[PDB]
Design a protein around this ligand. Structure first.
Ligand SMILES: *[C@@H]1O[C@H](CO)[C@@H](O)[C@H](O)[C@H]1NC(C)=O
Ligand SMILES: *[C@@H]1O[C@H](CO)[C@@H](O)[C@H](O)[C@H]1NC(C)=O
Ligand SMILES: *[C@@H]1O[C@H](CO)[C@@H](O)[C@H](O)[C@H]1NC(C)=O
Lengths: 208, 117, 317
């Protein structure tokens, strides 16, 4: 992707180009008259009598100084933009390269796994490795299961049905397991929870 | 006194251009399309919405499409999908993939120094 | 046109100066482009459009004040409608690329995705889930069991619906609720009224009107008076553009924060304290506003407490 699509790296090239343009503009301003008889200081000094040359030179001084201050001001603003970018890059380096971030879309789309820095001219490129669901199925669910008059809730998961039997799975991956007293916890009776479904709950101790 | 902008597919694609008058009514200025963003001359307006290519403004974009000409259109915002809300069913992943993406950030500016004298 | 409007002689003198007009035009073009990038980064985070479900009662939770109202010409929520109703020479104002309707459509898609898919749609494919179960997951995300939500589901839905109604009344009641957006509008209005007013100054010239200089003075003197006006107007434009660049940077920082909040709280559940409202964060809902975004942050806050004796451990056997 990086080899075939050069626009991918446009963010860094634009910074280079912007500074190059500013420098070329700064140089180009030296060729302007700004109202003077000539853009060249030596032509003014050779053509005019001192008191006249002083006026023409002061005019060129004003023009060049205004151009230089304009250059510095735009460099201060662009530098502030670069500082903000560098601070964001440092934050991402600390939170995603040296840790697993839980911030959504902070370091790539999907759920963050890890990241790797790469050096680039006047910048940093982060490769963000994320976990992304690929295939899904629809299952019938319920907020709780009613068994012996008490309401059973998953400890770490969701109750699903495959059309004839109820199972409990992890939320981010389909992995059906038998619903047991170890997978669920009990709180309250079967009368309070809205949409509770009647089902068997397996007790691992009863066979032994 | 509005500005004049040239909309081009690019030198390496086509030498046809469209000209946008930013705030001039087409009555004051043949594929002449009056938009909220100005009078666009040379682009053919179509009803079909497409992903934005060359932005014009106020929801209007232009692109080079098939015989070949510049087409003006209202930009599409995204693919459609079914929310499929249900009070008794959940969708759960059965498979997964690993995705790697790239984020590029500037870190530093070229260091320069200019002698005032 | 600003410096030398309808004056050939002034333009000819302006050409003796360097590429100041080019730099000023590039700066303003760059700002306008940044403003469209900011709008897309804040709102165009999801490239798939989800439809509003046919109902408003999702487990007892009433979303009628946040979802678009299809019966009005403006497909805006009651809250968005209120937000839009409260906020109100060579100078050209360009339209935004994304219209208010397009922004409302992105907001609606985000609300539909949040309601039927929770945070899942923002980090992979959207997976349908019942809303009370989405809330159960959001409660677990703050250290509260699922039984609390299900046993108190009616109370929670009622508190939520009342809180939303309170938001509508709060925004309507207080003129300053949307002060940040009005302040941005007013600052730019002042910047342009000042820039226009600068054209009436003499700057030491025989007259502030360029045509009076041209008709009253011979070229050997008219050029001097014009050069004075050129210096004054050019300085005024450089000041204006510099202030616009600084304000643009401030707006960019705001847009970046809004985009971060959008992706971390609308498309997820954040654990960052006070990042998205006071209390323990449960969920967020975006709303479009003129030149900005309004976030409704739904949080869990302890309401009643009792004092108990405690111990770090129990000694038994
Ligand atoms: C549900 O799963 C159980 C265990 O694999 C199986 O015996 C049963 O036939 C399944 N029912 C359906 C409708 O797929
Ligand atoms: C899951 O998707 C991967 C895609 O690389 C495929 O190779 C694999 O066979 C799939 N497995 C299942 C169980 O669907
Ligand atoms: C939602 O609330 C509005 C008033 O805020 C009311 O008119 C509407 O009927 C309510 N809808 C439901 C489903 O309760």
């Amino acid at each position: 992707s990086l080899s075939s699509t050069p626009s991918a790296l446009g963010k860094l090239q634009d910074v280079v180009n912007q500074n190059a343009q500013a420098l070329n503009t700064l140089v180009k301003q030296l060729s302007s008259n700004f109202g003077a008889i000539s853009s060249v200081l030596n032509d003014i000094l050779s053509r005019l009598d001192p008191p006249e040359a002083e006026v023409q030179i002061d005019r060129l001084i004003t023009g060049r100084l205004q151009s230089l201050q304009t250059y510095v001001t735009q460099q201060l603003i662009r530098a502030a933009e670069i500082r903000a970018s560098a601070n964001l890059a440092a934050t991402k380096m600390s939170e995603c390269v040296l840790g697993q971030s839980k911030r959504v879309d902070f370091c790539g789309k999907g759920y963050h796994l890890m990241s790797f820095p790469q050096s680039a001219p006047h910048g940093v490129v982060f490769l963000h490795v994320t976990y992304v669901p690929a295939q899904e199925k629809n299952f019938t669910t319920a907020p709780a299961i009613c068994h012996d008059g008490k309401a059973h809730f998953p400890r770490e998961g969701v109750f699903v049905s495959n059309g004839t039997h109820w199972f409990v799975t992890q939320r981010n991956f389909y992995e059906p397991q038998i619903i047991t007293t170890d997978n669920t916890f009990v709180s309250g009776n079967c009368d309070v929870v809205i949409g509770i479904v009647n089902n068997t709950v397996y007790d691992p101790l009863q066979p032994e | 006194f509005g500005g004049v902008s040239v909309i081009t597919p690019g030198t390496n694609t086509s030498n046809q251009v469209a000209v946008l008058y930013q705030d001039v009514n087409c009555t004051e200025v043949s594929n002449v399309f009056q938009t909220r963003a100005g009078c666009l001359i040379g682009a053919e307006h179509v009803n079909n919405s497409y992903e934005c290519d060359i932005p014009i403004g106020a929801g209007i974009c232009a692109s080079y499409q098939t015989s070949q000409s510049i087409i003006a259109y209202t930009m599409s915002l995204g693919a459609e999908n079914s929310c499929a809300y249900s009070n008794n069913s959940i969708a759960i992943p059965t498979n997964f993939t690993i995705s790697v993406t790239t984020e590029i950030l500037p870190v530093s500016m070229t260091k320069t120094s200019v002698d005032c004298t | 046109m600003y410096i030398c409007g309808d004056s050939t002689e002034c333009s000819n003198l302006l050409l003796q100066y360097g590429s100041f007009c080019t730099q000023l035009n590039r700066a303003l073009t760059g700002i306008a482009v940044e403003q469209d990038k900011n709008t897309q980064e804040v709102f165009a985070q999801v490239k798939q459009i989800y439809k509003t479900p046919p109902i408003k009662d999702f487990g007892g939770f009433n979303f009628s004040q946040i979802l678009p109202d299809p019966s009005k010409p403006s497909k805006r929520s009651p809250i968005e409608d209120l937000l839009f109703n409260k906020v109100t020479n060579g100078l050209t104002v360009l339209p935004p690329l994304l219209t208010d309707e397009m922004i409302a459509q992105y907001t609606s898609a985000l609300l539909a995705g949040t309601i039927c898919s929770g945070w899942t749609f923002g980090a992979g494919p959207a997976l349908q889930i019942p809303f009370p179960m989405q809330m159960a997951y959001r409660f677990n995300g703050i250290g509260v069991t699922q039984n609390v939500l299900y046993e108190n589901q009616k109370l929670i839905a009622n508190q939520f619906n009342s809180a939303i109604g309170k938001i509508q009344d709060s925004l309507s009641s207080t003129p300053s609720a949307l002060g940040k957006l009005q302040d941005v509008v007013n600052q730019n209005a002042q910047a342009l009224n000042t820039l226009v007013k600068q054209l009436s100054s003499n700057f030491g010239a025989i007259s502030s009107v360029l045509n009076d200089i041209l008709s009253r003075l011979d070229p050997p003197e008219a050029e001097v008076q014009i050069d004075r006006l050129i210096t004054g107007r050019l300085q005024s434009l450089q000041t204006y553009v510099t202030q616009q660049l600084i304000r643009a940077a401030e707006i960019r920082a705001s847009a970046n924060l809004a985009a971060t909040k959008m992706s971390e709280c609308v498309l997820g559940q954040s654990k960052r304290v006070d990042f998205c409202g006071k209390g323990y964060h449960l969920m967020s809902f975006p709303q479009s506003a003129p030149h900005g975004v309004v976030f409704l942050h739904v949080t869990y806050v302890p309401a009643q407490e009792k004092n108990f004796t405690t111990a770090p451990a129990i000694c038994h056997d």
